[PDB]
Short mmCIF file of C-alpha atoms (C1' of nucleotides) in Angstrom, two decimals:
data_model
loop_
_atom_site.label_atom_id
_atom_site.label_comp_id
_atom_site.label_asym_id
_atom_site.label_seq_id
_atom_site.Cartn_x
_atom_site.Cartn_y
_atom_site.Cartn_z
CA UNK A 5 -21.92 -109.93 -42.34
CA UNK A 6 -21.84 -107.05 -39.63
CA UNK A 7 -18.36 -105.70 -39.20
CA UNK A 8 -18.19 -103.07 -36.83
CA UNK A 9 -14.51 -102.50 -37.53
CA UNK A 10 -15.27 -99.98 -40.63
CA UNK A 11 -15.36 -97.31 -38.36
CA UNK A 12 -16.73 -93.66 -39.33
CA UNK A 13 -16.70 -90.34 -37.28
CA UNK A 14 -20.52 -89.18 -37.46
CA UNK A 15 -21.21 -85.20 -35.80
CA UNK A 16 -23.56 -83.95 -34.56
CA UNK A 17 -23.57 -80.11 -33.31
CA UNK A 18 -21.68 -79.27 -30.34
CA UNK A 19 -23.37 -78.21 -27.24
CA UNK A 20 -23.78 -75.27 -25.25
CA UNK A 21 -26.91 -75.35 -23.65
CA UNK A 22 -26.70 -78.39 -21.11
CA UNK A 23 -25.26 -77.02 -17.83
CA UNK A 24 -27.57 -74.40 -18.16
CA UNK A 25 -29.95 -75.99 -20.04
CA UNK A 26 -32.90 -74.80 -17.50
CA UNK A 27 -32.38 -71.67 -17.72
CA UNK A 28 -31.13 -71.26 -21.57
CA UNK A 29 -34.08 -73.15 -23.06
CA UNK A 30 -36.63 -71.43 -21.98
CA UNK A 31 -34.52 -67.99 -22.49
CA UNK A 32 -34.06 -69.22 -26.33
CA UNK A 33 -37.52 -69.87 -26.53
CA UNK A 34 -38.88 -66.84 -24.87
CA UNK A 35 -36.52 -64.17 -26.80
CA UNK A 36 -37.29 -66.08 -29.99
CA UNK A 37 -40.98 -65.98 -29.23
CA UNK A 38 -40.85 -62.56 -28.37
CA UNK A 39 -39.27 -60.97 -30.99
CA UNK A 40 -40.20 -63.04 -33.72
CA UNK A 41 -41.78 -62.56 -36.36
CA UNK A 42 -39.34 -60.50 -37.91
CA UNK A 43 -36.67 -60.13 -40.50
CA UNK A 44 -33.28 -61.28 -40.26
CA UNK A 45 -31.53 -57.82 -39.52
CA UNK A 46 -33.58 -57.58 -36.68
CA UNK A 47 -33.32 -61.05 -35.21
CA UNK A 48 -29.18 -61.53 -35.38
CA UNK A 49 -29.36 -57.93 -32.84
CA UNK A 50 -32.53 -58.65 -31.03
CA UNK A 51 -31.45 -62.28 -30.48
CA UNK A 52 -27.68 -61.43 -29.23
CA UNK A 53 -28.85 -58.49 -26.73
CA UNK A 54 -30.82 -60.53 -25.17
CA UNK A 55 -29.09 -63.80 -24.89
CA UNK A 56 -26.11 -61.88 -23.43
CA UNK A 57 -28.65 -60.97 -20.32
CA UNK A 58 -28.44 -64.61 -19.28
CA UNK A 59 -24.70 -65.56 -20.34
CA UNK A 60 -22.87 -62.56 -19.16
CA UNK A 61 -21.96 -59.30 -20.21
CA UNK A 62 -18.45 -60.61 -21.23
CA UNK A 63 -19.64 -63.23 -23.70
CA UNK A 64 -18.25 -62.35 -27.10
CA UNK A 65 -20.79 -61.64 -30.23
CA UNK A 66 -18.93 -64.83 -31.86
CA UNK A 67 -20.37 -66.94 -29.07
CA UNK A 68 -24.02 -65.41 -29.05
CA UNK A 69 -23.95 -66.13 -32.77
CA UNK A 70 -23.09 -69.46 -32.24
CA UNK A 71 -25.61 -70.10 -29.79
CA UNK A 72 -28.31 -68.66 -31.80
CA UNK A 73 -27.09 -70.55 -35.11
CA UNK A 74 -25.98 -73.77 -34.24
CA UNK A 75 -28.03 -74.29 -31.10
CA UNK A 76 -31.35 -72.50 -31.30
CA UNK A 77 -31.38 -72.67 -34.97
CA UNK A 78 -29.99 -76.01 -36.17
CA UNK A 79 -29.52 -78.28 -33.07
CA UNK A 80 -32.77 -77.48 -31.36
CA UNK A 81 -34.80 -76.62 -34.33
CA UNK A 82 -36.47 -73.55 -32.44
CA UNK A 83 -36.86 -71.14 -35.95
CA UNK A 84 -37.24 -71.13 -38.97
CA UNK A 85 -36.75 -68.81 -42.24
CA UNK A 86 -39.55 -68.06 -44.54
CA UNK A 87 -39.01 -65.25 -47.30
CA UNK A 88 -37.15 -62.82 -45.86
CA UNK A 89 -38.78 -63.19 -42.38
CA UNK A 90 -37.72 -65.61 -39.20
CA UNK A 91 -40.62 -67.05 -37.64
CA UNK A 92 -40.72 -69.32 -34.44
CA UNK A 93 -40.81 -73.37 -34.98
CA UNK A 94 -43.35 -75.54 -34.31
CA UNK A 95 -41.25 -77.32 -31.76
CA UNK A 96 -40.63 -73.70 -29.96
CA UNK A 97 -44.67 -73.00 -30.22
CA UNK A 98 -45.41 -76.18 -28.63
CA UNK A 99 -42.97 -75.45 -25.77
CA UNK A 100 -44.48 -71.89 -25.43
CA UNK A 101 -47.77 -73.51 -24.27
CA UNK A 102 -46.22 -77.19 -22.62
CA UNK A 103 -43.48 -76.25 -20.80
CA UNK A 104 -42.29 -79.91 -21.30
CA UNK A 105 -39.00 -80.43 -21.50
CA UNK A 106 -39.05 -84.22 -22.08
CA UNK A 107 -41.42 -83.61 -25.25
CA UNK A 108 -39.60 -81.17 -26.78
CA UNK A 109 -36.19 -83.76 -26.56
CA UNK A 110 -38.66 -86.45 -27.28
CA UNK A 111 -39.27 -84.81 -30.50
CA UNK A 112 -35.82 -84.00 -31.61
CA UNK A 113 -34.79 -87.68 -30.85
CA UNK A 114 -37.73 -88.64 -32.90
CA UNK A 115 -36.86 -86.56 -35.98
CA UNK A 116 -33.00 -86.54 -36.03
CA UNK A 117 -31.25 -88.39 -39.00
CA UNK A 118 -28.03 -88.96 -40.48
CA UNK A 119 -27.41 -87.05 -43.69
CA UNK A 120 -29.16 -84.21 -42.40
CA UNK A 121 -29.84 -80.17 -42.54
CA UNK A 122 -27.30 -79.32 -39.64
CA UNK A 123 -24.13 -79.99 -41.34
CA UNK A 124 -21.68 -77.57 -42.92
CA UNK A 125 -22.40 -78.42 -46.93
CA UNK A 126 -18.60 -80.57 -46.64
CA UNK A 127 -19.22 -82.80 -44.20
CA UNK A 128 -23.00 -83.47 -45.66
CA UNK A 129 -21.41 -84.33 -49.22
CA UNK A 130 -19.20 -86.41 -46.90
CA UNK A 131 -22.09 -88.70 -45.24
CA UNK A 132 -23.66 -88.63 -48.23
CA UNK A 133 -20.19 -90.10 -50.28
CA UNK A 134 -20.45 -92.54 -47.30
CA UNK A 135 -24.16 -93.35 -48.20
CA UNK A 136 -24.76 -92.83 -44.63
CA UNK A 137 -28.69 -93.25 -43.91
CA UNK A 138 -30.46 -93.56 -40.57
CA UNK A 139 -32.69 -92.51 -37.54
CA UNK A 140 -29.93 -92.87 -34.93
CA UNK A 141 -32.27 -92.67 -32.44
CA UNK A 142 -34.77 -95.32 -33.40
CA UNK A 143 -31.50 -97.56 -33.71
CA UNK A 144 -30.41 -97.38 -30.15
CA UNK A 145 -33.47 -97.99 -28.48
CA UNK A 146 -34.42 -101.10 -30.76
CA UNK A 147 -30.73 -101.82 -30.05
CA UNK A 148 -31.35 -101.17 -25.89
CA UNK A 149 -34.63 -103.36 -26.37
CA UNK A 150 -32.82 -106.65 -28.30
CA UNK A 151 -29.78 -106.21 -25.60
CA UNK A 152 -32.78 -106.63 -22.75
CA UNK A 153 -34.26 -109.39 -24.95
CA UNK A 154 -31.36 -111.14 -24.54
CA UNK A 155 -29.76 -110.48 -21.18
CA UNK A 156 -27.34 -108.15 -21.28
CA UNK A 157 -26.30 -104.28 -20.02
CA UNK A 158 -24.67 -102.20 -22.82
CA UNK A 159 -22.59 -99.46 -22.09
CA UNK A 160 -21.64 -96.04 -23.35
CA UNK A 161 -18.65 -97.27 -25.17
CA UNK A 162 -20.48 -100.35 -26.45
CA UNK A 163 -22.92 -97.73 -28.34
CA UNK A 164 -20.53 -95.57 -29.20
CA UNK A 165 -17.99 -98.33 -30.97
CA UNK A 166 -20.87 -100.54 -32.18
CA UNK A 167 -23.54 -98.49 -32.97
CA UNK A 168 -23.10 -94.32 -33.73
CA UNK A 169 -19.43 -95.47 -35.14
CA UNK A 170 -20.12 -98.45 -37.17
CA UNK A 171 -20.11 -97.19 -40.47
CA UNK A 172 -22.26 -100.38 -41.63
CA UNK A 173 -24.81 -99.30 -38.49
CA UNK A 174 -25.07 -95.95 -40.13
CA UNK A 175 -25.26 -97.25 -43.29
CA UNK A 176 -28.85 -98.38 -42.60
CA UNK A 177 -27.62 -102.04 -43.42
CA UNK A 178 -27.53 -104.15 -39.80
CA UNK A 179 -29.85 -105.21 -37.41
CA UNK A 180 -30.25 -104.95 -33.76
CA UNK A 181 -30.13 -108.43 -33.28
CA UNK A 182 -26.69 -108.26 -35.50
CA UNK A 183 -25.07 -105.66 -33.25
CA UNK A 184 -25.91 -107.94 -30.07
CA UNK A 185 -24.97 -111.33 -30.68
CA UNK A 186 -21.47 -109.23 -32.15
CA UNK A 187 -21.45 -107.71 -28.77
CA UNK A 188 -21.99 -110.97 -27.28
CA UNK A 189 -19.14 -113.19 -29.49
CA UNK A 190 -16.34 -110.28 -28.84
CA UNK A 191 -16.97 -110.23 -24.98
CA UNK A 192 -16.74 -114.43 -24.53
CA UNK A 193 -13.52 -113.66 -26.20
CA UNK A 194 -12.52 -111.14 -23.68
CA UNK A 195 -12.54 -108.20 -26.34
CA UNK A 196 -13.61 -104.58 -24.99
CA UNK A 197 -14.28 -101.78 -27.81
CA UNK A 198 -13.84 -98.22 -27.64
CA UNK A 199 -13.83 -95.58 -29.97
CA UNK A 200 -10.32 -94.51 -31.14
CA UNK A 201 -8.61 -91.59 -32.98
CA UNK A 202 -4.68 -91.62 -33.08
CA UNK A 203 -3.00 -87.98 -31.67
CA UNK A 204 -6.84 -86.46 -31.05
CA UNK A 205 -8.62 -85.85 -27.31
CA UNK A 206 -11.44 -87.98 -25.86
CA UNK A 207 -13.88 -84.96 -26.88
CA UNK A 208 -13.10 -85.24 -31.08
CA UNK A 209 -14.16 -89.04 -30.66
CA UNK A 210 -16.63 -89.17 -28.19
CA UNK A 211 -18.64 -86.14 -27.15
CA UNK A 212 -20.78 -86.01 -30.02
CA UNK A 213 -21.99 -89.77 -28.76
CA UNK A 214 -22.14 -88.57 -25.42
CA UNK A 215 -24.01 -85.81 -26.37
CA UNK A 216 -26.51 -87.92 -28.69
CA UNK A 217 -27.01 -90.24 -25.54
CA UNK A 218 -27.67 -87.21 -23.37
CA UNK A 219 -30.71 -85.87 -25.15
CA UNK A 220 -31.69 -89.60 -24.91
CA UNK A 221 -31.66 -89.28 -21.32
CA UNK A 222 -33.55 -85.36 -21.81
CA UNK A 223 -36.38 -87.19 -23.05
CA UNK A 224 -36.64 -89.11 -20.37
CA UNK A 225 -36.21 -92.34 -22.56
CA UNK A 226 -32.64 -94.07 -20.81
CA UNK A 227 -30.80 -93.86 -17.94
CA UNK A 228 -27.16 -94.15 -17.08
CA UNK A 229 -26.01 -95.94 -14.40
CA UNK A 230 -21.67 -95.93 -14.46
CA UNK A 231 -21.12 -96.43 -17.49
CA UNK A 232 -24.06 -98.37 -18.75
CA UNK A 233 -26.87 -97.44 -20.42
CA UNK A 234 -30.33 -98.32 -19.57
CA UNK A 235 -33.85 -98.19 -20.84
CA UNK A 236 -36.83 -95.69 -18.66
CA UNK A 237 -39.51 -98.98 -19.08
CA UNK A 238 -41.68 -96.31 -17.26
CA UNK A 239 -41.52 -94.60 -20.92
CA UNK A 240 -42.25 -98.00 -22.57
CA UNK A 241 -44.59 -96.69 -24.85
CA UNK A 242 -42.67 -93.62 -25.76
CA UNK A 243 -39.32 -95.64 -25.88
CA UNK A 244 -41.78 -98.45 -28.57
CA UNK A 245 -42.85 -95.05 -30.49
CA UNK A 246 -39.51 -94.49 -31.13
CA UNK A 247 -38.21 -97.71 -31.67
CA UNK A 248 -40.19 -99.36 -33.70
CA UNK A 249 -38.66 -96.57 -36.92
CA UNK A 250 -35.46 -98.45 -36.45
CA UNK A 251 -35.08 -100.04 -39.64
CA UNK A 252 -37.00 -96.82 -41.81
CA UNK A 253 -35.37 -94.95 -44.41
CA UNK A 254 -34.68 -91.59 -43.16
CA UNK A 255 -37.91 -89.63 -43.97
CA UNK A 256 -36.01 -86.61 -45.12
CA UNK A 257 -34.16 -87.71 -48.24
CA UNK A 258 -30.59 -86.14 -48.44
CA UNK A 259 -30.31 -88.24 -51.74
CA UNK A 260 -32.52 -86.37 -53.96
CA UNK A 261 -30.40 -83.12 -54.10
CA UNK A 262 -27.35 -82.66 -56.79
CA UNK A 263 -25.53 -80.49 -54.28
CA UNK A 264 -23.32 -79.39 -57.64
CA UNK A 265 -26.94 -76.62 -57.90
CA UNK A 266 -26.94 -73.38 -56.31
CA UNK A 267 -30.89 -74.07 -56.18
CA UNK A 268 -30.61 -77.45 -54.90
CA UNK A 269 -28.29 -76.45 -52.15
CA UNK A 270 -30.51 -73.61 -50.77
CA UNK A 271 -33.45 -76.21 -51.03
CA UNK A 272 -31.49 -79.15 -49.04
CA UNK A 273 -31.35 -76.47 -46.23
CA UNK A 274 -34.50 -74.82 -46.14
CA UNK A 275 -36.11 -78.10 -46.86
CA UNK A 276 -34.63 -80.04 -43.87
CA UNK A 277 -35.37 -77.00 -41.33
CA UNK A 278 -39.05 -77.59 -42.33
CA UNK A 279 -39.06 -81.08 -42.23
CA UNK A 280 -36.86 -81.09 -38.37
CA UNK A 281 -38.50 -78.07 -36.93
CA UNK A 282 -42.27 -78.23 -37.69
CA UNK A 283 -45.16 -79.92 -37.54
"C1'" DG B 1 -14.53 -64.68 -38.05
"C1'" DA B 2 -21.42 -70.61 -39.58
"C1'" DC B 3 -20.86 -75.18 -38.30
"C1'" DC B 4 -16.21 -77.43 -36.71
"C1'" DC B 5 -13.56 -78.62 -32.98
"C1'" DG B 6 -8.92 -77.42 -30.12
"C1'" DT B 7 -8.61 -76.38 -25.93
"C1'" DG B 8 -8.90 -75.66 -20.88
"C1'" DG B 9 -12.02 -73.78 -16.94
"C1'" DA B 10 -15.43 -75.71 -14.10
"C1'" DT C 1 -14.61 -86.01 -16.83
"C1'" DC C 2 -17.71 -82.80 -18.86
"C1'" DC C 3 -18.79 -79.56 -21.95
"C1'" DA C 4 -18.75 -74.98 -24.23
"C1'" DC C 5 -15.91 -70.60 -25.63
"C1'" DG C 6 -14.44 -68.64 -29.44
"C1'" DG C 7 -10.84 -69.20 -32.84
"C1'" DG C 8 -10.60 -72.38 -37.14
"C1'" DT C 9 -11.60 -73.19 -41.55
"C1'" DC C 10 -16.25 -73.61 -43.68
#
DNA sequence: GACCCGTGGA
DNA sequence: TCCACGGGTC
C-alpha cells in the first residue's frame, strides 16, 4: 500500500522570471522572436544585449546566460535548436499572436513530466535509477478534485509531503483516492507532514514545490488561500483537461535512451525540447 | 564559470 | 517568506 514516507527530492528549474514575470515574458518572447532565426553565435550575444535592457546594466553575463538557458530555453520552452540554427517555439509563436498568459502556463502544466529534458544528464540518470514516471500536473489536480470529492482543503505542505515528495506518487504507482484517505487517517491521528531535509534551508526542500504550484496558479487553474490550496471551478473544464492524464504514462519516454551513447544522449535532449516546446 | 542551489536582498 | 543572483559543480 501507499507509503508516503519514501520520500524523494524531485527539481524542477529555479526561477527568475516571477516578480517580473510581466515584463520578462513578453521581453523573452519578443527578443527571441526578433532575432530569431539565427545561429547560435548570434543568439547567446543578441539574446544577452538585450535582456540586460530590462534587468539592468549591472546584471552579470553569468546571469543573462542563465536566464536565457534555464528559463527561456528549458523552463519555459520558448526555442528550440534545429541544425545549427535556433528557431522560436511553438509555445513562443502562439504567445506572439495570443498574448495569453494563462495559455501559455496552461500549456507548460499540461506537458511537464518527471524524467524529463530540463535536467542536468546526473540528476536525469538519477530519476530515471528511481524509475520516477509522471505528469505532476495531471496528479495534483485529480488529487485537488478527489480531496473536493470528499470534503476536505489540502494545503501547500500536504502536496508537497504527499504528493511532489512521495517517491511512490512519482513513481506513477498511487492513486488520488490513495493519497486522500492517507491524508485523511494521519490527520484523525493528529499527524501534520512537512517536507524535511536535516542542516538544509526551507528553499532546497520546498521552492521547487512552491514554484510547481505557482505556475498552477499562472494558468489560472488553483488558488491559494493561507496556506491551502484550492481549485479555479471557473476553469472546470480546463482544470478536467488536465486532470483527467493523471494516471498516463508520461508521453515522452525517458526510458528508451541508454544514456551510456553519445548519440542517445544528444537525442534525449533534442528529442524532449521538441516534444515540450512545440506543437 | 549549464542546470544546481547557497545565500541574502527585497 | 519569497525568490533569483551568480558562484558551484555539472
Amino acid at each position: 500500500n501507499y507509503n508516503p514516507e519514501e520520500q524523494f527530492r524531485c527539481t524542477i528549474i529555479r526561477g527568475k522570471a516571477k516578480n517580473m514575470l510581466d515584463n520578462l515574458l513578453p521581453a523573452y518572447a519578443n527578443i527571441i522572436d526578433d532575432i530569431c532565426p539565427c545561429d547560435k553565435a548570434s543568439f547567446v550575444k543578441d539574446f544577452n544585449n538585450r535582456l540586460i535592457e530590462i534587468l539592468g546594466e549591472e546584471t552579470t553575463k553569468k546571469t543573462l546566460d542563465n536566464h536565457r538557458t534555464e528559463i527561456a530555453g528549458k523552463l519555459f520552452g520558448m526555442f528550440y535548436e534545429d541544425d545549427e540554427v535556433i528557431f522560436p517555439s511553438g509555445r513562443t509563436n502562439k504567445y506572439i499572436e495570443d498574448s495569453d498568459q494563462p495559455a501559455f502556463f496552461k500549456d507548460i502544466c499540461f506537458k511537464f513530466q518527471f524524467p524529463n529534458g530540463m535536467d542536468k544528464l546526473d540528476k536525469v540518470i538519477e530519476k530515471v535509477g528511481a524509475k520516477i514516471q509522471i505528469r505532476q500536473f495531471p496528479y495534483i489536480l485529480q488529487v485537488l478534485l478527489t480531496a473536493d470529492n470528499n470534503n476536505i482543503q489540502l494545503s501547500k505542505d500536504d502536496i508537497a509531503y504527499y504528493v511532489l515528495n512521495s517517491l511512490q506518487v512519482l513513481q506513477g504507482k498511487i492513486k488520488p483516492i490513495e493519497v486522500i484517505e492517507k491524508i485523511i487517517e494521519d490527520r484523525s491521528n493528529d499527524i501534520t507532514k512537512k517536507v524535511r531535509h536535516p542542516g538544509k534551508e526551507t528553499s532546497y526542500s520546498m521552492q521547487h514545490i512552491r514554484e510547481q504550484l505557482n505556475y498552477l496558479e499562472l494558468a489560472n487553474l488553483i488558488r491559494i488561500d493561507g496556506n491551502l490550496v484550492k481549485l479555479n471551478y471557473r476553469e472546470a473544464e480546463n482544470i478536467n483537461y488536465i486532470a483527467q492524464f493523471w494516471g498516463n504514462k508520461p508521453e515522452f519516454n525517458a526510458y528508451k535512451y541508454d544514456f551510456t551513447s553519445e548519440d542517445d544522449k544528444k537525442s534525449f535532449f533534442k528529442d524532449w525540447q521538441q516534444y515540450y516546446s512545440n506543437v
